[PDB]
Symmetry: D2
Subunit: 245 residues, 4 copies
C-alpha cells in the first residue's frame, strides 16, 4: 500500500489519524512521529505521503523538510496565511512533482459551509463569523473562520462594508478584523470544533452552522486527500477542489 | 404604473405589502381586498397583477378567479401541494398568457436555505427540518419546511433513508413524514418565521438556519416577482428561478 | 472500597462508567454485565450498588432483582413514567433500607436546564421542548425532555394552554403531547445528546439549551449519586435532590 | 393618572413607550421629548416619572436634571458602569425621596437569563457571553451582556479563571474582557436584541439564550417599573428586585 506517515501522532487528531491509516486496506503506516522525533524517520521509512496535525509554530519547518525530500503532504495544522502559502509555493518551485494540500477543515460540513458562505455573501448587508472551540486550541481565530471570512470578503468586493454605528466600545468587543469581516473566538470546555457564519439584511438573517462533535469527522476528508494527493502537483488550499460542487 | 392588487390587505403581511406597493414609484395600487370583499373589485380596478397573502382555505378560489380573468398572480399564501400545483397548471392551459408564481418564502435567506439544503443533502446520512413560527399560523408544517424536505428527498433519491433505531415512541414525537424527511413544527409566542435544516453524518452536523424577524423581509422578493411576473407565462414555483444562483 | 456493579458494561455509556468506577480510588468494581449475563453475578460478587445503562425493555426487570436483593441502584436508563416510578416504590415498601435513584440525565447542564425551565415557565404564554440525539436511541421523546415538559406543565398549572391557531396539519407535525407541552425528537447522525427548552411571550423568546458532546459528561453526576446513594432510602427521581440549588 | 414623561420619544424604543403610556389607563403622558427639546418641558408639565431611552452620551445629564428636580426615573439607556452608578447614588443623597431604576434589559427573558447565569456559573470551568444586536447600536458590548458577565464573575469569585491555551491571536479575536469573562458583540442587519450565555465543563455545555424580536418585549418591564418606582427610594439596578424569583 501507499506509505503514509503521521506527524502529531500522539495528538487528539493525529492519534485518530494513525488508527484510520492503520485500518485502511490500501494504506500502510510508515511512521508515527510526535514532538522530539526526528523527521528523518519519515525518509528512513520510505514515506510517500505525510499527514500533519501538529502546531502552528512547527508546521512550516515540517513542510520545508517534506518538500525538500519530495514527500507529499496533507496538512490539517492551522495558522496559515497568504504569506505562508506563498512560501510553500516558493519551496515547491524546486520540487515540481511534489503535491501539498493544506486545509483548515477536513469535515464535509465545514467545507460546505465555506462554499455556501461564498454563494450567500453578496445578498446581505452584514456578515460575521463566530467560531467556538475547546480551550486547548493554540490559535484564534480558527483557520476555518479566517478562511471563511476571506472568502466572504472576496465575494463582497465592490459592496459597502458592514454597517456599524458603534461609537463607544470596550477593546476587542467587535472581534478580529479579517478583511473587514468581524470574527469572534469562543474557547470553552466541553467544545470540540464549531462555527456559525451569520448574514443579515432588512428584517432577516441567515446562519450557516457547523459542528464537529467528534474528531472522527476529520477522517474521511483526510483519507480522500491522501488517496488523491498526486493528481494535483503543487499546492492545493482547501478540500473543495477535490470535490464536485 | 403596473397595476397591482393585494388580497389579504388587512393581514400581517398583506398590510405591509400594501405599503410597499403604494411606496414603489413604478407600481400603482389598484385594489386592497380583505375577507368579505368581492373579487370583482380587482377586475373593476383594472388590476394587472395580484399579490396574495390570505389563508390556505381561500387561495385556490382566488387563483381560479385570477386565472379565469387573465390576472397575473404572485402568491405567498401557503398550504400548497403537488395536486394544488397540478390544478393551477390545468387552469393555466386555458389562459396561456397568464403568469402565476407561488412561493412559500419570499425572503432571500429562506430561498438560499432551500438551494443550499438541495446541494448539501447527498453528503449526509441524516436530514431533518425544524420550523418555528408565531402561534397564529394556520398550517403545520410550514410551506417552506415542506418544500425544503421535498427538495432534500429528491436530492437523496437512491440513498438509504435516515437511520433511526426508535423502537418505543409517543405519537408525533418524530415529527411529520415529508417524503421520508422528519419535519417538526414549533408554534411559539414571540416568533415570526424561522427554520433550521439539519444534516448529520459521522461525528458532525450542518445546520442551515433562517430567521425573518420582521415581515419587511418578504417585501423585496415579492416586488421582484411582481416586476418580473410576465417573463414566465404559466406557473413558477419558488423565487429561485428569478434569481441567478 | 464501596462495591459497584455496572449493567450495560459494553454500551456506549456503560463502558465509560466501568472505566470511571475502576479509576475511582474509593470504588471497587464488583461486576460488569451486559446482555445475556445472569444477574446473580451481582450477588455472587457482593455488589452493594449498581449503575444501570441498559435498555427501556429490561430496566424494570433489573430493578426488581436489585430491590429484592437489597442492592442500591443508580439508574440512567430511560423509558420511565409515573406508573413505572409507582411500581419501583411499591417494590421498595418490602425493602425499606434500599435506595434507588433514577435520573434521565446525569449531566449538570441538563439538571440545571430542568431547574431553570421550572422557574421560567409561568412567565411565558408558550413552551415547547426540542430534543436531539444520535440515531441509535431506542426511545422518543427522550427521558430528559419528557421530564422537562412535566415540570413545565406542573409549574403552569392554572395558566392557559399554549396558544395555537393550527387548523390544517400533517400528522406528527406538532410533536408529542406531554402534559400539554409539545415535545419534538430529532434523531441525527453526528449527535450525542441535546435539548432546547423554548419559551415565548410578546416580542420575545427564551431558550435553555444543553449539549453533551461526550458521554464523559454523565460521569460526575453518576459517581456523586453512587457515593451518596445510602443517604436517601427509597426512591429519588432526578439528580437535583443531591444538589444545593 | 400618574404623570409620565418619555425622553427619546422619537427613537425606536421611545416611540413604542409613548404609545404604551398613552394606552395605559392609569398613566397620563405629560411630555414627549427628543433631541433638542429642553428638559424644562418635564417640569412645566408636572411630570412625576420619566422613562429614558436616549443615548449613553446624554443619559447622565438627563439623570442629573431629573434627580435635582425630584423626578423619578426609569432608565433603559445603556452605557452604565459602576462609576456612573456611584455618581447617580451620590446625586440621590441630596434628594432622598427620589427613586431611580436603571436596567439594561426590561424583557423578562433577559432578566431570567441573568438570574440563571448567576445560578449556573459555579458549576462550569468556562463562561462566555455573545450578544447580537442591530447595527444602529452605539455601545459594544451591550449593557445586558456586560451586566451578565459581572454577575458571572461575582458568582465565580475564588474559582479558577476560564482555561485558555491561546498562544497566537489576531487582536480582538477573544472578545472584550469583562471581569475575566470574554464578551463578544455581533452587529448585524436584521437583528433586534439577542444574547447567549455559554457555560462549559467536561464533555458538555449549557447555553442560555434570549431573543427580543420586537421592541414591544420591553414594554411590560418598563410599565411595571413605572408603576412601582416609588416603593424603592434611591437607586435600583435591574428589574430583578421588583420580581419574586
Ligand atoms: N484541518 C482540520 O480539519 C483540523 C485542524 N486542526 C488543527 O490541527 C492542529 C493540531 O490539533 P490537535 O490535534 O487538537 O492538537 P494537539 O495538541 O492535540 O496535538 C498536536 C500534537 O503535535 C505534536 N507535535 C508538536 N510538535 C511536533 C513536531 N515538531 N513534530 C511532530 N509532532 C509534533 C504535539 O506533541 C501533539 O501531540 C491544530 O493546529 C488545530 O487547529 C485540528 C482539527 C481538525
Ligand atoms: N411566502 C411567504 O414569504 C410568506 C407566506 N406567508 C403565508 O401567507 C399567508 C397569510 O399570512 P399572514 O399575513 O400571517 O396571515 P393573516 O391572518 O395575518 O392575514 C391573512 C389575511 O387574509 C384575509 N383574508 C381571508 N380570506 C380572504 C379572502 N377570501 N380574500 C381576501 N382576503 C382574505 C384575512 O382576513 C386576513 O386579514 C399564510 O398562508 C402564511 O403561511 C406568510 C409570510 C410570508
Ligand atoms: N441518565 C443519563 O444521563 C443517560 C441515559 N441514557 C440512557 O441510558 C440507556 C443506554 O444508553 P446507551 O449506553 O446509549 O445504549 P447502548 O445501546 O449503547 O448500551 C446499552 C447496553 O445495555 C446492554 N444490555 C441490554 N440488555 C441488558 C441486560 N438485560 N442486562 C445488562 N445489559 C444489557 C446492551 O447490550 C448494550 O451493550 C438508554 O436508555 C439511554 O436513553 C443515556 C445517556 C445518558
Ligand atoms: N433597557 C432595555 O430594555 C433597552 C435598552 N436600550 C438602550 O436604550 C437606548 C436607546 O435605544 P434605541 O431606542 O435603539 O435608540 P434610538 O437611536 O432609536 O433612539 C434614541 C432617541 O433618543 C433621542 N435623543 C438623543 N439625545 C436626546 C436627549 N438629550 N434628550 C431626549 N432625547 C434624545 C434620539 O434623537 C433618538 O430619537 C440605547 O442606549 C439602547 O442600548 C434599547 C432597548 C431596550
Ligand atoms: O479551523 C481550525 O482552526 C480548526 C478546525 C477544526 C478543529 C480545530 C481544533 O480542534 O483546533 N481547529
Ligand atoms: O413557509 C411558510 O408557511 C411561512 C413562511 C414565512 C412566514 C409564514 C407565516 O408567518 O405564517 N409562513
Ligand atoms: O433523556 C434521555 O433519554 C437521554 C439523555 C442523555 C443521553 C441519552 C442517549 O444517548 O440516549 N438519552
Ligand atoms: O443591553 C443592551 O445594551 C440592549 C438591550 C436591548 C436592546 C438594545 C438595543 O437595541 O440597543 N440594547
Ligand atoms: Cl475547503
Ligand atoms: Cl425558492
Ligand atoms: Cl434532575
Ligand atoms: Cl435584572
Ligand atoms: Na493500513
Ligand atoms: Na406606488
Ligand atoms: Na476503583
Ligand atoms: Na394613558
Amino acid at each position: 500500500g501507499m506509505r503514509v506517515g503521521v506527524l502529531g501522532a500522539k495528538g487528539k487528531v493525529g492519534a485518530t489519524m494513525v488508527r484510520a491509516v492503520a485500518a485502511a486496506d490500501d494504506l500502510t503506516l510508515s511512521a508515527e512521529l510526535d514532538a522530539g522525533d526526528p523527521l528523518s524517520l519519515l525518509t528512513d521509512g520510505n514515506t510517500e505521503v505525510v499527514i500533519d496535525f501538529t502546531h502552528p509554530d512547527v508546521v512550516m519547518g515540517n513542510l520545508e523538510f517534506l518538500i525538500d525530500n519530495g514527500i507529499h503532504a496533507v496538512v490539517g495544522t492551522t495558522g496559515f496565511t497568504a504569506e505562508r502559502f506563498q512560501q510553500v509555493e516558493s519551496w515547491l518551485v524546486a520540487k515540481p512533482n511534489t503535491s501539498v494540500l493544506i486545509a483548515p477543515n477536513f469535515a464535509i460540513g465545514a467545507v460546505l459551509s465555506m462554499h455556501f458562505a461564498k454563494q450567500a455573501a453578496r445578498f446581505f448587508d452584514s456578515a460575521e463569523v463566530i467560531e467556538l472551540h475547546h480551550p486547548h486550541k493554540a490559535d484564534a481565530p480558527s483557520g476555518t473562520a479566517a478562511r471563511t471570512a476571506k472568502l466572504i470578503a472576496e465575494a463582497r468586493k465592490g459592496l459597502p462594508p458592514n454597517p456599524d454605528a458603534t461609537s463607544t466600545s470596550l477593546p476587542g468587543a467587535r472581534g478580529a478584523d479579517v478583511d473587514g469581516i468581524p470574527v469572534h473566538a469562543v474557547r470553552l470546555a466541553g467544545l470540540v470544533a464549531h462555527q456559525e457564519v451569520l448574514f443579515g439584511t432588512e428584517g432577516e438573517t441567515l446562519t450557516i452552522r457547523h459542528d464537529s462533535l467528534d474528531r472522527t469527522s476529520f477522517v474521511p476528508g483526510v483519507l480522500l486527500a491522501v488517496r488523491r494527493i498526486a493528481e494535483r502537483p503543487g499546492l492545493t488550499v482547501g478540500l473543495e477542489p477535490l470535490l464536485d460542487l
